[PDB]
Every structure is written in C-alpha cells, then in structure tokens.
Amino acid sequence: DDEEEDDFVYFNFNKEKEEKNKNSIHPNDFQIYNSLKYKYHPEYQYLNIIYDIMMNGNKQSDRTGVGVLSKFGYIMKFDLSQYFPLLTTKKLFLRGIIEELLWFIRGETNGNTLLNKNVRIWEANGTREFLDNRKLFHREVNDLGPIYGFQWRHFGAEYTNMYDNYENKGVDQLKNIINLIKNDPTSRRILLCAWNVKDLDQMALPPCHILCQFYVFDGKLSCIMYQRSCDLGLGVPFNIASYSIFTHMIAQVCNLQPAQFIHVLGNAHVYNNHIDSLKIQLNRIPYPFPTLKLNPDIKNIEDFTISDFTIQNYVHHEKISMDMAA
C-alpha cells in the first residue's frame, strides 16, 4: 500500500526543491488559494495558469523595457453547455468585445467605426505614430489594414484602403466554414485563419488569435482557438469571452448546440505590473458562472446586433485594475 508510495519520492529525485520565483512571489500571499483542497470550478483553469506562470515563469524583457513572466503552451477547456465562462474573480464588461466581433463579421478594418461606438480596443494601434513605426507611412489613421475582418471575408484579395468595396473578392472563409459545418460536419478542415503571411506587414499588427478550428459531433459544436501571444492578466479574460460568444453564434446559425470552447495559449505571459493585482485575484473564490442568451431568431451569422446578446446571472467580485499605477 505505502509500498508504492515511497516510489513516488524516488521518481521525483531530480526535482527542483523550490519553485523558481517563489522568492519573488511569496506564499503567505496566496493563502486562500493554497488553503483550498478541491478547486474544480472551471475558473481555476485560468487561475492555475496565473499561479503557474508566477511561480515558474521565465523572466523576459520586451524590446520595450517592459518586463514579463512567460511560459510556452497551455490549454484550457470550457463546457459552454453548462456555463458561460466569464471570469468571476473580478469584474468584466462585454459590450466592447461583442461589437468587435460584429465588426469582424462585417469584414471591417475601419478603426473609426469602433471609436464612434466608444470601443477603443484598437485605438492605440491606429494612431499616426503607431502606423509610422510599423512603417505604414501611407496608411490612413485608424485604417488598421488587412486584419481579421478582411481576412475572414476576403483572404487573398489585394488590400487597398478601409473604404474599398471588396464584394466578392478573395476567399470568404467565414461563409465557407459555416457551409462546411452544415454540409460536411465531420470535416477536419473547418478552419478560420487570420494569419495571412502575405499581408502581415500591412496589418497595424499581426493577429494575436491565429485561427479557430471547429469540431462537430452528435449535433454539438466545439471550437479550438490558437492564440500566439497571451496577456494573462488583462487580455486573456476577454479572449475567453469573445471566442466563447463566437462559438455560440456559429453554433446557433448552424442549428447545433455549443459544446466546448478550447483555448490554446502559445506565448503565455504575465506583465510584472499585474502581479500584485493577480495575487489579490488568486485569493478570491469564484462564484458560479453566468449564462449567455442569444436572440434565438438570428439564423444568419451576419444578422446579429448588440441587442441580441444577454449575459444572465453574472455574480462577481469587485473590479481590480491590473495596473495599480493610475
């Protein structure tokens, strides 16, 4: 019985005695997080990764002078049939990310459209100074280039400017993956890819969300999204919501029920400036997730409007500003 128990110790003979930056993170600190015996709430898939990066992340310095702790390769899975994975250990807002999604679906690359709705997710990426530093001297302010929307609806088309009528130009992948899901569900080529190698330098910035791959089984839809770069403290929380919402949308217009949203993280990092906030967050106990309700009449991916989305029973801890600087 204990026979094989000591064997466990022998197999761990070459292991590092203490966690790497434990010295810098400090445990009395995560004392509620470590006091939990069973953490089966899905939000822990996210929280455990924050803990893992903090304790074993590699110190790296962006070419900005900014600092981060990073790891490579993680995977989170959320059962959209049981809950909507909107983090509860801090307050999250969704109007902006839903509008961004609707904007992608329209195929837009016009930064002004979002700004006029006070969605500033892409604002910094469209300034005169940011485009010039990207060597986009001939790009108009807020014209983000052939990004997401352009690639989703016109991959391969020659980008001109954000106002051009690209009707019927390039490959409408959005339309294609939907048709594949409806007619050929067992296909292993249902991918929506935004990483167009030919157009990268023309984009305000390369896409963080590389692609989405879909899987269909017994009338149920699952989605895997591969993220090449992940800001754990600020971006990922929204990333999980966006793609979970997208999954429901694609699922409903194809008359399938959503199953799992599978998040694959490539370069997963935590900015040093977020550490204090994240430590606080790690000690909060998650509340039961809320649910997402889509207007059931929408049957075309292009007919969704902001009023068609509703988050129900969202119970959460108070907001935290990752950067406590001001």
Binding site: S81, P288, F289, T291, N313, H317, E318
Partner: protein, 216 residues
C-alpha cells in the same frame, strides 16, 4: 483530547440557497459576496420549486456511507460520551417533504419540535424536544454522519451554539421570491475549503461549495 461536540459527534449541515429579489430593483446587484446566496424557501417550499441536479447531490451526500471508516468513529465517540446517516430537520421542513418521499430512504430521520407526538410516528423515525436532546439520541444510535437539512430556524441555532462541522452549501445562481433565509455565515468561524465544477440544471447554473469550521 475529545470534547467539542461538532467535531466530536460528526454533525454536518447541508443546504441550497438562491439569490433574493428586492422590489425596489430586482437584478444585477452592485455588490456581491457569499451572503448573496441566502434564499432558503418560499411559502413552505423551495424558492425554485425543484432542481434535479441538487436533488441528486443532496440525496447522494446524505445517504453515502463508508463502513470501513466507521470504527474510527465508534471508537472515540464511545470513548467520549446497514449503517445509515442521520438527517435532522424541522417541523415546517418535515411537512414540506412530499408523501411518497417520507421518511427519506436509507436515512435515520430526526425532528426538532415542541408539539409532535412521538407516540404517533415509527421507531426507525425519532423526534426531539430540543437541540441538546439531539446529542443524546446520537449517543444511543449507530450512524455514519449527522446532517442538519434545515430549515432556517434549525440552521441558525445549530450555528450559534456552534455544532456545525462542515456546511455543504449549494449555490443556486438565479433569483426567486423568498420568505425564509439562511443565516449569514461568519467568515471568521467558517471558511470555504472546496469549490466544485459548475453545472446547468433546470435552466440555471449552480455549483457546490464546502464550508469548514476553522478549527481556528
């Protein structure tokens, strides 16, 4: 050295609470916390009527028994003073349970009352006049664990007197009309040691959390 009953005699509390609606503004609370989930019952019944997942949880927890671990218990208990668990409830509570479902099967049903006639019910179905009289009925019976299944009044006193070891709290994440609530748990007397997976049942999400008696 064994003399604080709760830990001593193995008494646990199990409940399921939903969110409460306020006439002035019904939803989307500005500030949330553990107390958010306190709806216990409404007009003699559950505020949400029925939830099969929580029903299954409640039943599985109150009827589960591990016999091999029973003498570690028969031991100190004797030493302190078809294995089934004990389910202590209130009268209003016992009267809410349907007909076909009473008593709760594979469970030693107990009741807290001041008017119920022991003369009237079965023997495998005991009653008691007061809290402290329970400890007594325990020292005589052969059970695995004692579960205080409500209601409000019963939860309150059992908590005040400090007889509760663990609280198997189910969080019904939806709002309903309520008239009876669970007592605000003292964060310094009890702490959450476990949190389950989240599920959807009967059109509402819910999860199960375990509160512990800070031995401290």
């Amino acid at each position: 050295m064994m003399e604080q009953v709760c830990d001593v005699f193995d008494i646990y509390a199990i409940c399921a609470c939903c969110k409460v609606e306020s006439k002035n503004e019904g939803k989307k609370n500005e500030v949330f916390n553990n107390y958010t989930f306190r709806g216990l019952g409404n007009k003699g019944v559950l505020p949400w009527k029925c939830n099969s997942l929580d029903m299954k949880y409640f039943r599985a927890v109150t009827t589960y028994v591990n016999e091999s671990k029973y003498e570690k218990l028969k031991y100190k208990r004797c030493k302190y003073l078809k294995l089934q668990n004990v389910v202590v409830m209130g009268r209003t509570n016992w009267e809410s349970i349907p007909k076909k479902f009473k008593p709760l099967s594979n469970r030693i049903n107990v009741i807290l009352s001041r008017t119920l006639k022991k003369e009237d019910f079965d023997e495998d179905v005991y009653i008691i006049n007061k809290v402290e009289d329970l400890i007594v009925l325990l020292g005589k019976l052969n059970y695995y664990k004692c579960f205080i299944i409500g209601g409000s009044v019963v939860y309150q006193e059992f908590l005040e007197k400090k007889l509760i070891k663990k609280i198997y709290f189910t969080r019904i994440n939806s709002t309903y009309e309520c008239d009876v609530f669970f007592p605000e748990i003292n964060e310094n007397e009890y702490q959450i040691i476990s949190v389950s997976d989240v599920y959807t049942s009967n059109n509402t999400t819910l999860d199960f959390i375990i509160y512990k008696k800070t031995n401290n």
